[PDB]
Amino acid sequence: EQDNRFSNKQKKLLKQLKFAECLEKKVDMSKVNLEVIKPWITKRVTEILGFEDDVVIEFIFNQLEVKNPDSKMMQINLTGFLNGKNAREFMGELWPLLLSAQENIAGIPSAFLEL
């Protein structure tokens, strides 16, 4: 904002991290039902953590409810709470499920279409 002697650490990670695979196809949120996903997110993380962390839950929710989310930024922000590779796998697992739900006509992922 006012300082020059510090670098943008986000951009630095934007260069120097190892990211997930589905993180390219931009995604909109109008086309999505979330309240179907929400329990999936909850159980996913709660297992990753062995306990429940409401704040991480709501963090992911709030980062998603935007018009179009940045998968890069989201993987970064979860890298702290989860163990880094867990974040890569988790995001590259949810984001394709997002693509599925969004090309679905009801907006729901094919996993819960089947189940």
Partner 1 sequence: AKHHPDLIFCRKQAGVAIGRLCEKCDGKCVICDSYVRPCTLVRICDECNYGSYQGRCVICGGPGVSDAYYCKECTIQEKDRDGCPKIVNLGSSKTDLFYERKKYG
Partner 2 sequence: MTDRYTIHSQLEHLQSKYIGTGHADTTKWEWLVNQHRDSYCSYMGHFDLLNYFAIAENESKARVRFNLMEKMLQPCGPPAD
> Smallest distance, Å, CB 14 to partner 2?
13
Span from 6-14, 44-52, 57-65, 81-89 in contact with partner 2 (CB under 8 A) = 6-14
Q: Are 27 and 95 in contact (CB under 8 A)?
A: yes
> Smallest distance, Å, CB 8 to partner 1?
17
Cβ nearer to partner 1, comparing 2 with 30: 2
What is the 3-state secondary structure of 57-97?
Answer: HHHHHHHHCCCCCCHHHHHHHHHHHCCCHHHHHHHHHHHHH
Task: Output the six-digit token pair for 102.
Answer: 């969004």
Query: Contact between 2 and partner 1 (CB under 8 A)?
Result: yes
Binding residues for partner 1, per CB under 8 A?
Answer: 1-3
